[PDB]
RNA sequence: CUACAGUCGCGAAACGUACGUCC
RNA sequence: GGACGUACGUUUCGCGACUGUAG
């Protein structure tokens, strides 16, 4: 929040919302119940614990900031939106996403176990320019480093997703204002 | 080699001392260096010129066969004579000279009932020290029970010589069918009164050091519903109540034979009900014998149908619709081609008339199994967790296991996984690791527990007080005095002898009368009892030159029966040392009297009682 | 020349006339025993009747042997003796042999033979019939054929003069009996089977006996197996490979076997192999120039399997080297043979690995423990005394030349000279003279009974290595069965003998019903043409209206058309059998079949293609559908003779 | 004990003992095991039943006593830790010896067949005079009978062989007091 | 007392390969 | 070619017996 500001932070869809979430009206702050909440079985609910957004692609202007606290396990990146339902995020050759494993490891995926350092993000926020391909994720104070390097394939929609295990109850993500 | 720990000499301690106990050690492989412990101190401690003879009651060949190689790697290095009798080594060297040349030997129980029932073996005061496996089943009626009524029964009345030492090393005593800790603590001095034994040692001292070896796992309960749009249920039950109304319109009866009165589609309730109402059509007396046939046969098939409807609709609540599908149709391929009536190309006709429906509504995506569903949904998720863990998944039903199998091979997202039958990631083995999920069964390590029916998690739960109640009925029980102890443990023992000998006169009569035994779906006459040889008192059959113009024969050879459309396997050709006699199963026949005018059900040979003529070649 | 008194003590209860069970443990007592009786039996005839005792021989150079006695001693008496074998009944008569001798000493197949054509009509003809080794008179042997035509004469109630029928055995054998009383029965059948009353035995002579007994000691040394098993993981490795390229070309091959999982190194896996192989000769795809490709290729896979599943058994028993010795030998063969794209490819795949197991095998570490301590045990005695004498008993044919390769070349064992017998300090043989006192029965399981010299005992050593206990439990029962044999024996002693003739006559009488009831006649011979294909290529060999039969046991095959489609080789070994001699050993005349399909023989004056069904698959013409008939009586169609007249 | 103490009694070691033999705690009383166990495998397994000991060479003063009584047959003498282990004690180049045969009879090697009469120690001692290659067999008290004298090439330390009859489980020797 | 899975014991049969013998 | 025997291993079938789960 010290250099310009260029966009403004996604939205979630009820569309494809996970089946034992529970975000509600702000759309920017998820929530994980015990027993997993009956909704209509199709081919855009998603039936798995990835959770995507809701805003329109531009050229270079993207900017985010989720709070990480409060959750175990989690994995929030950026990549294509047009995939099959019954796949899941990170697996795909084109995924600019960070998987942080339960053995306790920063890892990312590039399909390749691209595995980083052993840093436990606080407050991380997607900063993405599609047109001037620099990839920058500054996490928490220190002289704003990125810690991460995506290349990316700019020729897709590229929606902002979350993943995350939600099976102990009372789980949250939620977005701040920057 | 390997170590000794200290709970592990703890746990032998007080049996070393010379008294009969129960080790209750939990599982990990550790029972089996505890037994090694004491063996090795037992079989030294006689002094020359005598000797000890350490005798361990295994149960399961697999189990005997491993701890038959533990022994032998573990004690020929010192110099003792390990053996093993089984039921696998032929009929070979009467056991009595094995137990003289030898000194730790592996049984498996059943055979040490043998050789004192006929007395190739004098008695128990042969041996010196008992060790049973999993002596928490010594029970109503186990072997290790028929074993403990020899010893108990040489022990008390004609006072014989020494007795062994008796051991016992289960993991868990097992206080089922008790409310509260009285209960428990009668059922568990029941069981120490049953194996003779007066301390129930487990470690105290270094619990945490045992905890640092076993993990018990928090559990994940999973209470998902069932359907709603159950097209498939709506067209079955509309087969189930015409087939019920067709065998309604021809018995007129139906609904008094049975005793179930309330019956719901798709359970053992109406599985109780389709059987009990198979027993009672069979018996009926009449004097049209073409009207017998007629109706029995007629009945024959429509409960049949009935009870594979039944059975289609509990198979197909737990698992696909396409595994139910692929079960009623080779169901109906394989009697279509049994045997050709009106009656089976009715039902034949009825069910294809609706097979494509079923076919188009049962493979739908959108009607999809929310069990299985969310199982796949689990498997997902920790696999994407860590992809190194392994499952061992228990079903209730060997069905299930293979229509699973069936499934996890018709998932593509599922291209990952091994499944195995009971180099592997997942295995479905039914009542026999990082991940023990139970479909329905009632370090790093979770147990799920998915069902439909909620209230056999109270069932879990019933079950985590009843584990609480055992700990403290053992930590009540383990505070005792040690004479109090005995003189109960006596008392229970000589009551439980005295009940044991007055009511054993179970002597049948065998009965001299002439009977016929009918076909159990045709009803049509097969043989008389007075016909029928029994050649080694276990292969009954049938002499008889009119008995063979009743059977079509189609391993080896299996009949059938000879009517037009009847169908009916009554045994199997078989070859005796020269001969080629056919056998026959009681299970599909009905017996009748031929001076009364009964026709009486029966199960397995040894039920029915006649006059047993021994087979010859003359 | 002189006899002694258990040699008479044996011969006292054959002199009164009833049949007898003589059980002596010297190997030249039952010769003299036998001569005694034999002796005995013609001088009590009066004048001008004849005795005419035959003694049976198993064996030929028993027979050669019992000729030579019993010719070099009745000849100062003047009596006839000669002997038939099968190497000297062709060309020569056998009735005017029976009627001119006396003590003829004939082999039993000879005596089947002519009872089932004709001449030698009844069993009357003699006075004395002596078995050597009655012990085998067991079941469909040809000393129970005999005894099946001596029984239904007696039995008949038709009888005539039947004769004495005494036995020389040295152990009457239990059998599968567990205690006294199932071992008193094994007897029982046994004397009635032989028709006997009285077991004689040496029970007032034992000092006699026991100098002369031949009685070693056991020295049961279980030992283990290896731990670094490189070799079995290598070729665990190309057997997976050869598995998974025989998929490929046969997906549904878990579908051809109902065994459990198969384990590299048993005898359960060569049976899935036999299994699968015999399976997949039955294809019928209708391409039927591609199914002689596919079958041919199904063959040499499951060929290549078997063969380093022999491999495998070889390097856990024998040394390890013995092992890529046997699998170069048969890859020379086949290099030798010919070539493929299939076998080129499965040569070049064991030529990537020859390296890397020829340097595993060259390691000083890796010696069988059962071998490391086999020549420990062969320094030790000799160190102790350098004038022992051991034998080698070995089980496989293929184990007994290993270990004699593996003393050419140890640098502990260099006074040992291998003496295979299948200036011999060692004989390393397979099956058996009671002059070595060291027996070592290297993994080998009625006991291994060395008593037959006219020597002495002087104490052996009867050393027995294994690697698993079943070896070692199996004797320490058979010491238990051979403590209950002799019981059984001295509780049959005590009977009466006028309750144990009537006895015997149950169970004869029993077993003549059970034997007359399966007397079922052939079933109906199938009438029409069906035709033969060979099991590796499949193509036409002939059809079956061209099968004649030589002697209703052997068949040939009498088209012009098959002349050309066998191609012929000699024998590594000919001989004679009973009309024949074995000239050449036949094999397919494809490009690279060269299945062995039989022999060809010199029967009168012609030379014929004796072929054998256990390698050919019988097609119907009619259906279509092929099977694997794999004994010539079980393939039942419409047997025509053969007939010198047609050619 | 008897005459001047002129040696202390050998041990034998636990790297070039053979396989199959099974010396105490004490390390001076050798037994033959029921089976044989694992051991080691270098160059310094006999592979028979040969033992050595660790008692050095000197200018003279060399006599040792072991009880030989309740031993089936032995062989007893001297030999030179430059022998290949695969050989046989007495039967080398150099090293002397006095056997037990078979034949009941007390027979001696030397690189030939001498021998003595039918003659059996409960208890023998061998003398050394190290500087010049000497040997006296003293059994017991008879007027110091030896009956067998033998020179020694001393080129190398005497570290002195003994060989028992391995095939009899628990058959032994002990070593005792001079 | 009905179904369901899990186990043990007793007898009968067939097959494969190897080894030895005989015609 | 064929017949016999022995050893090892595998499979099949019948008859019992026992325990647990749910109705
Ligand atoms: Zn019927
Ligand atoms: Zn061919």
């Given at each position: 929040?010290?250099?310009?500001?260029?966009?403004i932070?996604?939205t979630?869809?009820?569309?494809?919302?996970?089946?034992?979430?529970?975000?509600?009206?702000?759309?920017?702050?998820?929530?994980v119940?015990?027993?997993?909440?009956?909704?209509?079985?199709?081919?855009?609910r998603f039936?798995?614990?990835?959770?995507?957004?809701?805003?329109?692609?531009?050229?270079?202007?993207?900017?985010?900031?989720?709070?990480t606290?409060?959750?175990?396990?989690?994995?929030?990146?950026?990549?294509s939106?047009?995939?099959?339902?019954?796949?899941?995020?990170?697996?795909?050759?084109?995924?600019?996403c960070?998987?942080?494993?339960?053995?306790?490891?920063?890892?990312?995926?590039?399909?390749?176990?691209?595995?980083?350092?052993?840093?436990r993000?606080?407050?991380?926020?997607?900063?993405?320019?599609?047109?001037?391909?620099?990839?920058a994720?500054?996490?928490?104070?220190?002289?704003?480093?990125?810690?991460?390097?995506?290349?990316?394939?700019?020729?897709?929609?590229?929606?902002?997703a979350?993943?995350?295990?939600?099976?102990?109850?009372?789980?949250?993500?939620?977005?701040?204002?920057? | 080699?390997?170590?000794?720990?200290?709970?592990?000499?703890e746990?032998?301690?007080?049996?070393?001392?010379?008294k009969?106990?129960?080790?209750?050690?939990?599982?990990?492989?550790?029972?089996?260096?505890?037994?090694?412990?004491i063996?090795?101190?037992?079989?030294?401690?006689?002094?020359q010129?005598?000797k000890?003879?350490?005798?361990?009651?295994?149960?399961?060949?697999?189990?005997?066969?491993?701890?038959?190689?533990?022994?032998?790697?573990?004690?020929?290095?010192?110099?003792?004579?390990?053996?093993?009798?089984?039921?696998?080594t032929?009929?070979?060297?009467?056991?009595?000279?094995i137990?003289?040349?030898?000194?730790?030997?592996?049984?498996?129980?059943?055979?040490?009932?043998?050789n004192?029932?006929k007395?190739?073996?004098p008695?128990?005061?042969?041996?010196?020290?008992?060790?049973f496996?999993?002596?928490?089943?010594?029970?109503?009626?186990?072997?290790?029970?028929?074993?403990m009524?020899?010893?108990?029964?040489?022990?008390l009345?004609?006072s014989?010589?020494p007795l062994?030492?008796?051991?016992?090393?289960?993991?868990?005593?097992?206080?089922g069918?008790?409310?509260?800790?009285?209960?428990?603590?009668?059922?568990?001095?029941?069981?120490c009164?049953?194996?003779?034994?007066?301390?129930?040692?487990?470690v105290?001292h270094?619990?945490?050091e045992?905890?640092?070896v076993?993990?018990?796992?928090?559990?994940?309960?999973?209470?998902?519903?069932?359907?709603?749009?159950?097209?498939?249920?709506?067209?079955?039950?509309?087969?189930?109540?015409?087939t019920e109304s067709?065998?309604?319109?021809?018995?007129?009866?139906?609904?008094?034979?049975?005793?179930?009165?309330?019956?719901?589609?798709?359970?053992?309730?109406?599985?109780?009900?389709?059987?009990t109402?198979?027993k009672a059509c069979?018996?009926?007396?009449?004097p049209?014998?073409?009207?017998?046939?007629?109706?029995?046969?007629?009945?024959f098939?429509?409960?049949?149908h009935?009870?594979?409807?039944?059975?289609?609709l509990?198979?197909?609540?737990?698992?696909?619709?396409?595994?139910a599908?692929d079960?009623?149709?080779?169901?109906?391929?394989?009697?279509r081609?049994a045997?050709?009536?009106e009656?089976?190309?009715?039902?034949?006709?009825?069910?294809?008339?609706?097979?494509?429906?079923l076919?188009?509504?049962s493979?739908?995506?959108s009607?999809?199994?929310?069990?299985?569903?969310?199982?796949?949904?689990?498997?997902?998720?920790?696999?994407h967790?860590?992809?190194?863990?392994?499952?061992?998944?228990?079903?209730?039903?060997?069905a299930?296991?293979?229509?699973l199998?069936?499934?996890?091979?018709?998932?593509?997202k599922?291209?990952?996984?091994?499944?195995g039958?009971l180099?592997?990631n997942?295995?479905?083995?039914?009542?026999?690791?990082?991940?023990?999920?139970?479909?329905?069964?009632?370090?790093?390590?979770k147990?799920?527990?998915?069902?439909?029916?909620?209230?056999?998690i109270?069932?879990?739960?019933?079950n985590?007080?009843?584990?609480?109640?055992?700990?403290?009925?053992?930590?009540?029980?383990?505070?005792?005095?040690?004479?109090?102890?005995?003189?109960?443990?006596?008392?229970?023992?000589?009551?439980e002898?005295?009940?044991?000998?007055?009511?054993?006169?179970?002597?049948?009569?065998?009965?001299?009368?002439?009977?016929?035994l009918?076909?159990?779906?045709?009803?049509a006459?097969?043989?008389?009892?007075?016909?029928?040889?029994?050649?080694?008192?276990?292969?009954?059959?049938?002499l008889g030159?009119?008995?063979?113009?009743?059977?079509?024969?189609?391993?080896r050879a299996?009949?059938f029966?000879?009517?037009?459309?009847?169908?009916?396997?009554?045994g199997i050709?078989?070859?005796?040392?020269?001969?080629?006699?056919?056998?026959?199963?009681?299970?599909?026949?009905?017996?009748?009297?031929?001076?009364?005018?009964v026709?009486?059900?029966?199960?397995?040979?040894?039920?029915?009682?006649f006059?047993?003529?021994?087979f010859?070649?003359?």
């Amino acid at each position: 929040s010290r250099f310009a500001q260029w966009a403004i932070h996604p939205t979630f869809n009820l569309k494809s919302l996970s089946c034992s979430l529970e975000v509600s009206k702000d759309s920017r702050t998820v929530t994980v119940s015990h027993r997993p909440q009956p909704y209509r079985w199709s081919c855009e609910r998603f039936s798995t614990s990835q959770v995507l957004c809701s805003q329109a692609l531009s050229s270079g202007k993207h900017y985010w900031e989720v709070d990480t606290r409060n959750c175990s396990h989690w994995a929030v990146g950026v990549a294509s939106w047009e995939m099959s339902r019954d796949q899941v995020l990170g697996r795909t050759m084109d995924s600019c996403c960070v998987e942080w494993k339960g053995t306790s490891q920063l890892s990312a995926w590039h399909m390749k176990e691209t595995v980083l350092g052993s840093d436990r993000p606080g407050v991380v926020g997607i900063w993405l320019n599609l047109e001037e391909g620099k990839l920058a994720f500054y996490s928490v104070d220190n002289q704003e480093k990125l810690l991460y390097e995506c290349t990316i394939s700019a020729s897709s929609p590229l929606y902002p997703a979350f993943w995350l295990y939600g099976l102990h109850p009372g789980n949250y993500l939620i977005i701040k204002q920057v | 080699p390997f170590k000794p720990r200290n709970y592990q000499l703890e746990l032998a301690l007080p049996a070393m001392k010379g008294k009969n106990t129960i080790i209750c050690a939990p599982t990990g492989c550790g029972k089996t260096f505890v037994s090694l412990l004491i063996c090795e101190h037992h079989l030294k401690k006689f002094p020359q010129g005598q000797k000890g003879k350490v005798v361990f009651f295994a149960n399961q060949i697999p189990v005997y066969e491993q701890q038959k190689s533990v022994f032998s790697k573990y004690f020929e290095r010192h110099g003792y004579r390990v053996t093993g009798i089984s039921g696998a080594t032929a009929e070979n060297v009467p056991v009595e000279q094995i137990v003289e040349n030898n000194d730790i030997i592996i049984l498996t129980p059943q055979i040490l009932v043998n050789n004192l029932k006929k007395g190739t073996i004098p008695s128990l005061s042969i041996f010196t020290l008992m060790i049973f496996d999993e002596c928490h089943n010594t029970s109503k009626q186990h072997p290790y029970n028929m074993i403990m009524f020899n010893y108990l029964d040489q022990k008390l009345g004609g006072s014989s010589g020494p007795l062994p030492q008796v051991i016992g090393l289960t993991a868990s005593v097992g206080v089922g069918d008790a409310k509260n800790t009285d209960e428990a603590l009668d059922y568990i001095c029941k069981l120490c009164a049953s194996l003779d034994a007066s301390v129930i040692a487990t470690v105290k001292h270094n619990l945490e050091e045992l905890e640092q070896v076993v993990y018990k796992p928090q559990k994940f309960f999973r209470k998902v519903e069932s359907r709603i749009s159950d097209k498939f249920k709506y067209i079955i039950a509309q087969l189930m109540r015409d087939t019920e109304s067709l065998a309604k319109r021809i018995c007129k009866d139906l609904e008094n034979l049975s005793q179930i009165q309330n019956r719901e589609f798709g359970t053992q309730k109406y599985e109780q009900w389709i059987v009990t109402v198979q027993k009672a059509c069979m018996v009926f007396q009449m004097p049209d014998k073409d009207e017998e046939s007629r109706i029995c046969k007629a009945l024959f098939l429509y409960t049949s149908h009935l009870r594979k409807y039944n059975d289609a609709l509990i198979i197909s609540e737990h698992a696909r619709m396409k595994d139910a599908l692929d079960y009623l149709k080779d169901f109906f391929s394989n009697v279509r081609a049994a045997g050709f009536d009106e009656i089976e190309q009715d039902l034949t006709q009825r069910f294809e008339e609706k097979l494509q429906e079923l076919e188009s509504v049962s493979r739908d995506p959108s009607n999809e199994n929310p069990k299985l569903e969310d199982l796949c949904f689990i498997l997902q998720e920790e696999y994407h967790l860590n992809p190194e863990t392994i499952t061992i998944l228990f079903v209730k039903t060997r069905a299930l296991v293979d229509a699973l199998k069936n499934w996890i091979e018709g998932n593509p997202k599922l291209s990952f996984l091994k499944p195995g039958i009971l180099d592997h990631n997942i295995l479905i083995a039914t009542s026999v690791c990082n991940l023990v999920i139970l479909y329905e069964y009632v370090r790093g390590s979770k147990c799920f527990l998915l069902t439909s029916n909620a209230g056999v998690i109270e069932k879990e739960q019933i079950n985590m007080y009843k584990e609480k109640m055992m700990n403290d009925s053992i930590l009540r029980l383990q505070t005792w005095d040690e004479a109090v102890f005995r003189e109960k443990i006596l008392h229970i023992q000589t009551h439980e002898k005295f009940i044991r000998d007055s009511q054993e006169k179970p002597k049948p009569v065998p009965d001299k009368e002439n009977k016929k035994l009918l076909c159990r779906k045709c009803k049509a006459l097969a043989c008389y009892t007075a016909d029928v040889r029994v050649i080694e008192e276990c292969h009954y059959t049938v002499l008889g030159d009119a008995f063979k113009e009743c059977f079509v024969s189609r391993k080896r050879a299996k009949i059938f029966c000879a009517r037009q459309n009847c169908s009916h396997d009554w045994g199997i050709h078989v070859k005796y040392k020269t001969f080629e006699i056919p056998v026959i199963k009681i299970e599909s026949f009905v017996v009748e009297d031929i001076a009364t005018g009964v026709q009486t059900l029966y199960s397995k040979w040894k039920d029915f009682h006649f006059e047993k003529i021994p087979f010859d070649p003359a």
